[PDB]
């Protein structure tokens, strides 16, 4: 419990630091929390279980927030904006977990970790599409273009922002000048 979260806390921190761009070792991980490699194994046999837990936090944070958005806001465009702002914001609030979202931190690890991340994206995108398809019945007029195209377009912008966020060592923040950037994104909605 206490030790387990400590290990996860240190992993997230390691993922966000200068070591974040390199392979994390079970040895280093143990050192950062001040325990032996053997002791760490008692909680996590591998780093795979660790990443699973992190990815689970990512899924929960985003999916949960997306549902709250859909309930508290009914305007299609506002929904889209909030969701995009949520994704960008979350990445900014979690530099280390973003590298997991972007797939860089998972290069080292097992393929089912990336697979789980892709599913999260497919999931968010499906939600994006469903939100878009309801514009018609809600506003009396839907989008002229294919919702699939607009959803992928919308998620692509997010992945692009996060990708630059990660490769810039978190210098280029996702929500920077968002009020200026969003109207341009919305304009892409046809």
């Amino acid at each position: 419990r206490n030790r387990r979260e400590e290990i996860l806390q240190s992993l997230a921190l390691m993922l966000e630091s200068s070591d974040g761009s390199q392979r994390i070792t079970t040895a280093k991980l143990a050192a950062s929390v001040g325990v032996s490699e053997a002791a760490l194994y008692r909680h996590f046999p591998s780093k795979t279980r660790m990443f699973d837990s992190l990815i689970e936090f990512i899924e929960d944070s985003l999916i949960t927030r997306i549902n709250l958005i859909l309930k508290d806001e009914k305007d299609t465009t506002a929904r889209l904006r909030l969701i995009v702002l949520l994704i960008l914001g979350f990445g900014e609030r979690n530099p280390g977990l973003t590298r997991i979202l972007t797939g860089h931190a998972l290069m080292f690890e097992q393929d089912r970790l990336q697979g789980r991340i892709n599913q999260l994206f497919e999931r968010i995108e499906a939600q994006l599409r469903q939100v878009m398809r309801e514009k018609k019945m809600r506003e009396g007029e839907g989008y002229t273009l294919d919702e699939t195209l607009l959803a992928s377009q919308l998620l692509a912008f997010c992945e692009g922002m996060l990708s630059r966020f990660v490769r810039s060592e978190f210098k280029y923040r996702p929500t920077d000048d968002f009020d200026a950037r969003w109207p341009l994104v919305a304009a892409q909605l046809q």
Partner: peptide
Amino acid sequence: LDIPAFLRKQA
């Protein structure tokens, strides 16, 4: 949006 932060700076 109360965006959750995995890492706490109280630690």
